[PDB]
Structures are given as structure tokens and as C-alpha cells.
Design an enzyme around this catalytic site. Structure first.
Site, short mmCIF file in Angstrom:
data_model
loop_
_atom_site.label_atom_id
_atom_site.label_comp_id
_atom_site.label_asym_id
_atom_site.label_seq_id
_atom_site.Cartn_x
_atom_site.Cartn_y
_atom_site.Cartn_z
N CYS A 1 3.51 -2.68 4.68
CA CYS A 1 4.40 -2.34 3.58
C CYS A 1 5.72 -3.08 3.70
O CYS A 1 6.21 -3.35 4.80
CB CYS A 1 4.64 -0.83 3.54
SG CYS A 1 3.13 0.12 3.23
N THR B 1 0.82 -1.20 0.00
CA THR B 1 0.00 0.00 0.00
C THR B 1 0.86 1.25 0.00
O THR B 1 0.48 2.26 -0.61
CB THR B 1 -0.93 0.01 1.22
OG1 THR B 1 -0.16 -0.03 2.42
CG2 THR B 1 -1.89 -1.18 1.18
N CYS B 2 2.02 1.21 0.66
CA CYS B 2 2.90 2.37 0.70
C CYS B 2 3.16 2.93 -0.69
O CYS B 2 3.37 4.13 -0.85
CB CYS B 2 4.22 1.99 1.37
SG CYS B 2 4.12 1.89 3.18
N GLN B 3 3.15 2.06 -1.71
CA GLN B 3 3.25 2.50 -3.09
C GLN B 3 1.92 2.46 -3.83
O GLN B 3 1.77 3.17 -4.84
CB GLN B 3 4.25 1.63 -3.86
CG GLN B 3 5.57 1.39 -3.17
CD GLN B 3 6.45 0.42 -3.95
OE1 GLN B 3 6.14 -0.77 -4.06
NE2 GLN B 3 7.55 0.93 -4.49
#
Lengths: 169, 169
Positions: B30, A59-61
């Protein structure tokens, strides 16, 4: 290779591989893939077909599929009959990814573009992965097809872009 | 291509890709892959390296990794310092598969044999997937290397086979 453009008929003979959803979110439930006849499914109604470079990217990306899930009611109101998420991962991985995202029904289907056959045929695949793109189809005709090339961007293939497309027709 | 046999040195320059475990089982946490230097790790102690044709294949056909998890204490008693599960799936998929199986630490690492580079080099890969096989290494020397070719069989690569190997040395 044929770049899809508005007004084009959705290509014939497009098939994906998927494990039909069961209503369960358990990632250990047994499953067996079947063919999904996408050209036939898209011949009637309004469909949204979204490709991602890979299942389970962080999710960070990546907040691509999460955005579609959050606005499923808006999509239903806009007249969307089916949402399909594809990637080059096999059907078992795509099924687990759908369940990991909390989807237990047909609100979004998670399917494999085996060997990027479809994505390559429209020019949006490279090195065994599909691109990140969204296609909107109405009664077998392409209404919108756009690809995100900026890494980490969903400007063209995100839910907000798709909702804008629908709000115009 | 060089079929690995007992007495062979474990090949040099073997590297995998993996997301280091964090202690969390959340599939949305992440992560970023790093290289795992397998030849260096296997140069000391006792290692078990297991390859599967694919992450997330159903239990109805597959109880390979579950068997290793159930007998981790026996493996620790037998002197095993590290257990590595590899497949051709990328590091993000392998990380999710490890978490789906309840592993949050280094008891079993889940890593990607990128492009089946290693598996192909020893003759146990085909069409983009690794075979199903197990390799037991002690201080950089192969003690056991065997492959399962019968579909749905873990006779050669299962935990029971590995425990028998260790109980002899």
C-alpha cells in the site's frame, strides 16, 4: 449520454484497447496493443464488464479485482463466458496491472477505455477516469448495470453483487 | 511556455506527485502519494531529470530507464546527487513502474508530472503525455536540456548523453 438500464441492448460500436495475454507474468515482455471489439464479444454468451477508477490503486483501499480473481470458479459455474476489467489507463499499464495480479490468460482481460469514451457515453466517467461500476450482459442485452459512488466501496460493482445477479436469472 | 536552455534558472514552483519508496519491490504494498518539491530539491547539488512519454512501454521499443539503471555507479562517480524519472502517469502507476524495474530506494525516483503541468510549461508535452527529454541541473541552474523527437530514440535524453554532459563541466 444514456444511462444503461436492465433490458437495454448493450451499445453498439464499443471498442477497447488491450495487449493480448501471452501466458507470461513478466512485466518486461514486449507487447503491442490491438482493438477489442466489445459490442461483438458481448453479443453472445454471458459477459461481466467491470470498470475501476485506476489501475494499480493500493489494496489498502481496493480489493475489487482481487475479489473477482478469488471467485473465478464460481463465475464459471454461474455461466460467465468472459470477464473484462477496464480503466482509463492505456493498454500497456492495464497489461502490467493484469500481470501484477497474477492473470496470464483470458480468465480476466484488462483493457483500456481510451479517453473514457465508453464510460462517458453511459454517464459513468469524470475528469479522465472511469467510474467504478459493473455491467452484466447476456446475448447483447444488459441484465445489470450499477455504479459505486461511495469511495472505497464495491457494494454494487463487486463480485458478490455480480454473483447475486447471476443466481437469479 | 518557455524553452529551457543552458544557463536558465530551473523554474520555480515545480512540483511532482510520487509514492515514496519503501525498500520493497512488491507491487501490492500500500502507498499514498505526496508532493515532491522539485525546484527546492534541484536548488542544491547535481540533478538529472528525465521524462518519458509513458510508464510501462515495452523494452522492444524502449531501453531508456534500463540504461540509467545500468550506469548508476557512473552517475554517482560523475557527481549526480539525484535522478528523477517523470511521466504523465499518476503516482501509483509510476511507483509500480519503478518497482517493476527493480528500484527500491532513492537511486532513481519515479514521479508524476500531473497533467503534464511542468512539461507543458517548457514546451515538451503533447496530448496529455510528456515528451522524452533530459535536464541536467547544478545548484538550481540548467546545464543541459534536450528532447528526443525521433520515435524510439534516446540520443539526447539517454544516459550516455547525460554522462557526456557531466564529463565536460
Amino acid at each position: 449520454m444514456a444511462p444503461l438500464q436492465p433490458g437495454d441492448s448493450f451499445p453498439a460500436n464499443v471498442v477497447f484497447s488491450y495487449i493480448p495475454p501471452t501466458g507470461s507474468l513478466d512485466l518486461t515482455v514486449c507487447g503491442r496493443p490491438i482493438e477489442y471489439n466489445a459490442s461483438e464479444a458481448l453479443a453472445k454468451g454471458t459477459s461481466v464488464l467491470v470498470a475501476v477508477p485506476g489501475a494499480f490503486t493500493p489494496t489498502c483501499q481496493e480489493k475489487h479485482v482481487t475479489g473477482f480473481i478469488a471467485k473465478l470458479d464460481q463465475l464459471r459455474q454461474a455461466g460467465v463466458d468472459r470477464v473484462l476489467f477496464i480503466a482509463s489507463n492505456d493498454a500497456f499499464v492495464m497489461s502490467a496491472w493484469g500481470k501484477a495480479n497474477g492473470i496470464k490468460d483470458e480468465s480476466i482481460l484488462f483493457l483500456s477505455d481510451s479517453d473514457t469514451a465508453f464510460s462517458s457515453s453511459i454517464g459513468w466517467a469524470n475528469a479522465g477516469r472511469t467510474g467504478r461500476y459493473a455491467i452484466v450482459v447476456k446475448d447483447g442485452k444488459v441484465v445489470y448495470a450499477a455504479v459505486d459512488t461511495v469511495r472505497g466501496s464495491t457494494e454494487k460493482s463487486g463480485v458478490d453483487a455480480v454473483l447475486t445477479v447471476l443466481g437469479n436469472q
